[PDB]
Amino acid sequence: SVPAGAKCRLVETLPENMDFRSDHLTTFECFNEIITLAKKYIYIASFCCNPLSTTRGALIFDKLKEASEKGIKIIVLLDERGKRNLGELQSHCPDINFITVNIDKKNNVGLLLGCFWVSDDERCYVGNASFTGGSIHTIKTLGVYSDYPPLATDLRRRFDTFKAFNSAYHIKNPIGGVFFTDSPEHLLGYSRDLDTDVVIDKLKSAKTSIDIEHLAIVPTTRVDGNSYYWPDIYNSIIEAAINRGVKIRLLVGNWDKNDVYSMATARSLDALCVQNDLSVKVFTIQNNTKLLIVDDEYVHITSANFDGTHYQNHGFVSFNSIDKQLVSEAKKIFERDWVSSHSKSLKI
Amino acid sequence: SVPAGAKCRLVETLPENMDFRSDHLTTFECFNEIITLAKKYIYIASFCCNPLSTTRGALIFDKLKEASEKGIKIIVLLDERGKRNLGELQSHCPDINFITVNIDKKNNVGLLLGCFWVSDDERCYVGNASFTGGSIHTIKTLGVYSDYPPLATDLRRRFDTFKAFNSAAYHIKNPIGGVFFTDSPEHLLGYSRDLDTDVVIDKLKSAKTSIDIEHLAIVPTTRVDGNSYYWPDIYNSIIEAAINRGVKIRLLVGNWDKNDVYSMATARSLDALCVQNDLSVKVFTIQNNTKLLIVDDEYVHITSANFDGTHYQNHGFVSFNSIDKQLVSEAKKIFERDWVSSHSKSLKI
């Protein structure tokens, strides 16, 4: 009935100046095939829309413009704080519907990240490649493409939820081994599962290994001029390594900004690298990859970073899979990134 | 009916070589009053019994010996891992009943700390002054004495629980007399006792204004049984109160080193938090058993355990809690004295 894996295949943006190589569908090829095969609609949700930054991004934008001129209903969702180039986006393509959204009318902290495409209720992409020229060509990204109509329909319902904010156990036995998790809690409705609870549960259930490629694993972030302390994911990682002997490899971005918090977290992680089975490598390249692999049997790909600001306020959809083949493909991706020349051991 | 405060008064050990001063009942005077007024029994629970280390402790030991010679039933509970001077304790006083206890027969990690005296179901002491000459004379300690029979009877039931391990809500919100006990570990709670872990974390999370803590170490990682154990529950409650709710927090902890990478890293983290939040950390080098927590100047917590994972997951102890305004204000002045003491210096390095 339902195909194993839900017809999902991994998508990558591997910049030519970087040493990352693979035979997966590229982000450019993914967006191009979605626009080409489109018959009725194309829905896109991202924090900001800035495709003209690279030549490949402008080509995707022009192909999307062609679809709009040929009757395809195209709607692009972007957060209110990415409204800088809104006038230029609508001037270039008057037939595209650009909508700014504010998902947090109470606190004005939550931001739309979504980071997914969906079209014709048949095809969809989901990952961490925003609708920018950087995410298409020059920034390393990781996502998932699928042409399974039930999965794309799930993403279309997420688009309905996000579009409604215009400014103007199924987790144990998923369908096809693939399921979505959502954020924030006040947008879950009655049926959707909070990504925070799923991620923490998978980290606590880890028996062997935890592999994470994220931007920053820090317990403290700055919610626009104010500090917010949220160590839930940070503690789950640390307690797995120390209390349960789980082998943990963390591939995170470089820190500084004279941030006392990020530096303190760096010294704490470096202190853990000397006595526990916790290894941390750092990358300096621009990298949007948000990847989590547990016991080589569960994979989690999203657009949010494992911090309190994202998982308490921001709006995003996260990809989850327990399909062994898709997990093994993601495991090979992380193994490549771990020993890459752009990943260096944590320095004191 | 029930007296406010449950007839509780603070008890301190202030060594003469230290600058700490107060008008509270001393630990020596407290133990002396318990031994003198004893009519039937005196029950004592501590990790170890080493009273002969100082002259004042040996004097208390001889008074307890005299009580045993006068028909008083004396039982001293000590942990099995404090069995060093057991032979000398029984040679000095053949009429005292010394019992070694192992509260964790499964894992052999939990230790008996109790740190309380109870006698005649009428009088009791509870705090962090063990039955040693150091805790009586040379080591700074803080405890509570009460002669309210219902409170001492509650503490006697804890003694019954611990003695059984021989080697051979509503009542928390409006307590009786504003005083109640919390207990540890979870596998010894029974059906009616409240876990000290949950109460401490709840009080820390409910803090609206101030959090004052005088403990040995506030670290998320300890060495339980040859292995490192990560437990940041109390650590996170403190930090999130300061960062997310703007609570003014003063932490008075002991000095660290031992080339411990974990304790050193935690030191750098706390000092990193001191630069942008209302969190101040001072360090003491003196010998100090004080385990004190004060929340919003309306809740006081005195115990013998340290706020770490080893204690609050394994060890057996009874913790004193009170919301009585008078007793809390007295504990608040104690912390204010300790905070600006000459033996407490701001965190450097």
Numbering used by the authors:
A (entry chain A): 6 to 173, 193 to 372
B (entry chain B): 6 to 173, 192 to 372
Quote the passages of the study that discuss this structure, keeping the authors' original sentences.
For the structural studies, we produced a soluble variant of F13 (sF13) by removing the hydrophobic N-terminal tail (amino acids 2–5) and by introducing five mutations in the MIR. We obtained two different crystal forms. In both, sF13 featured a homodimer stabilized by two helices and a β-hairpin with an interface area of 939 Å2, formed by a network of hydrogen bonds involving residues Y253, N259, N267, Y285, S292 and N300. The contact region forms a large cavity of 290 Å3. The hydrophobic N termini and MIRs were located on one side of the dimer, and the two phospholipase D (PLD) catalytic pockets were pointed outwards. Here we report the structure of an F13 homodimer using X-ray crystallography, both alone (2.1 Å) and in complex with tecovirimat (2.6 Å). Structural analysis revealed a large cavity at F13’s dimerization interface, which is absent in PLD3 and PLD4 homodimers. We hypothesized that this cavity reduces the stability of the F13 dimer.
F13 is a phospholipase anchored to membranes via two palmitoylated cysteines located in a hydrophobic membrane-interacting region (MIR). Tecovirimat is an inhibitor of mature virus wrapping widely used to treat mpox patients infected with clade IIb strains. Tecovirimat binding to F13 blocks viral wrapping, but the structural mechanism is poorly understood. We showed that F13 forms a homodimer on membranes, and tecovirimat inserts into a cavity formed between the two protomers.
